[PDB]
């Protein structure tokens, strides 16, 4: 049974709402496990408190740098980086959850949520989940973004964990 995790999103510290994700442990178990563990914080570190540093309307919301909080950092539960598990799943449309990277086999903790189909990322970023509930929260996050991704308010993961 694929796990489900949640983010409680805040905007300059004020609550916005909850987004939940199904993680495709049945297709990308190692990548889903990394995101699951970072969402519970069970290794002593993870997504809680971190921000969405890059939001580009029409494309995606990107976050997950909990080590440097500036979009350059992040780390996996396996080490600083880990390999591309597979590219079976595609960036088919809004709600797709996929790993950010700086080239082949550089997955850490940064991730992005698609707000449109981004098919040219297929075979370069590992898709491993999708928004289950709260896509309207992701839609609402877009207006705090901009052409180059700079955000006009601080969009943070106020709380996060695994749902039963």
């Amino acid at each position: 049974v694929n796990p489900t995790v949640f983010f409680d999103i805040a905007v300059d510290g004020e609550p916005l709402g909850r987004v939940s994700f199904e993680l495709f442990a049945d297709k990308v178990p190692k990548t889903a496990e990394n995101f699951r563990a970072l969402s519970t914080g069970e290794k002593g570190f993870g997504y809680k408190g971190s921000c969405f540093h890059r939001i580009i309307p029409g494309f995606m919301c990107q976050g997950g740098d909990f080590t440097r909080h500036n979009g350059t950092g992040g780390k996996s539960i396996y080490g600083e980086k880990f390999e591309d598990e597979n590219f079976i799943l595609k960036h088919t449309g809004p709600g797709i959850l996929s790993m950010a990277n700086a080239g082949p086999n550089t997955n850490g903790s940064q991730f992005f949520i698609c707000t449109a189909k981004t098919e040219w990322l297929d075979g370069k970023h590992v898709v491993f989940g999708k928004v289950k509930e709260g896509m309207n929260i992701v839609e609402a996050m877009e207006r705090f973004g901009s052409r180059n991704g700079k955000t006009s308010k601080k969009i943070t993961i106020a709380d996060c964990g695994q749902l039963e």
């Binding site: 890059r54 580009i56 440097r68 500036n70 979009g71 350059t72 950092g73 700086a102 040219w120 370069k124 052409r147 180059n148 991704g149």
Partner: protein, 168 residues
């Protein structure tokens, strides 16, 4: 008002386009890698006694979006063509950037400067003579730089302004 110069910084991923620009604008060195989407900066300087306003477009080196460079090449007045002296592929990528700029602007005469960056590192794979000969065949200046030590940073951007002045 002072004359404005539209400078555009181009080159392969990781050669130091942003580190050079941020050194120019903010006088410090970014050690971490923050991959660029697109950033714009403004700075006034004095060059050869004349005060002017630099408008700098710091571009992404991502090969995936090479088709989308044509629009900022249309707008730009001069191009800082950056490679890293320890990255021979980035030196080879220079030809494709210059060819793309010439094609987009439909001119053999576009203000450009060749910049070999990271000259503080000991792992040099592109010889100074190699880059100097390439720049001579293009008819443009060649400047060696380090965003880390600041060597040549002002010189690279100011030389590009002088190239635009000679063209205009």
């Amino acid at each position: 008002s002072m004359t404005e110069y539209k400078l555009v910084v181009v080159g392969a991923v990781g050669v130091g386009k942003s580190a050079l620009t941020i050194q120019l604008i903010q006088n410090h060195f970014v050690d971490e890698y923050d991959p660029t989407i697109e950033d714009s900066y403004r700075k006034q300087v004095v060059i050869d006694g004349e005060t002017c306003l630099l408008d700098i477009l710091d571009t992404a080196g991502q090969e995936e979006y090479s088709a989308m460079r044509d629009q900022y090449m249309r707008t730009g007045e001069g191009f800082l063509c950056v490679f890293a002296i320890n990255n021979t592929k980035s030196f080879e990528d220079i030809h494709h950037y210059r060819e793309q700029i010439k094609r987009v602007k439909d001119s053999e005469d576009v203000p450009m400067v060749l910049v070999g960056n990271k000259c503080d590192l000991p792992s040099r794979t592109v010889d100074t003579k190699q880059a100097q000969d390439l720049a001579r065949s293009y008819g443009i200046p060649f400047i060696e730089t380090s965003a880390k030590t600041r060597q040549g940073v002002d010189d690279a951007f100011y030389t590009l302004v002088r190239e635009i002045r000679k063209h205009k």
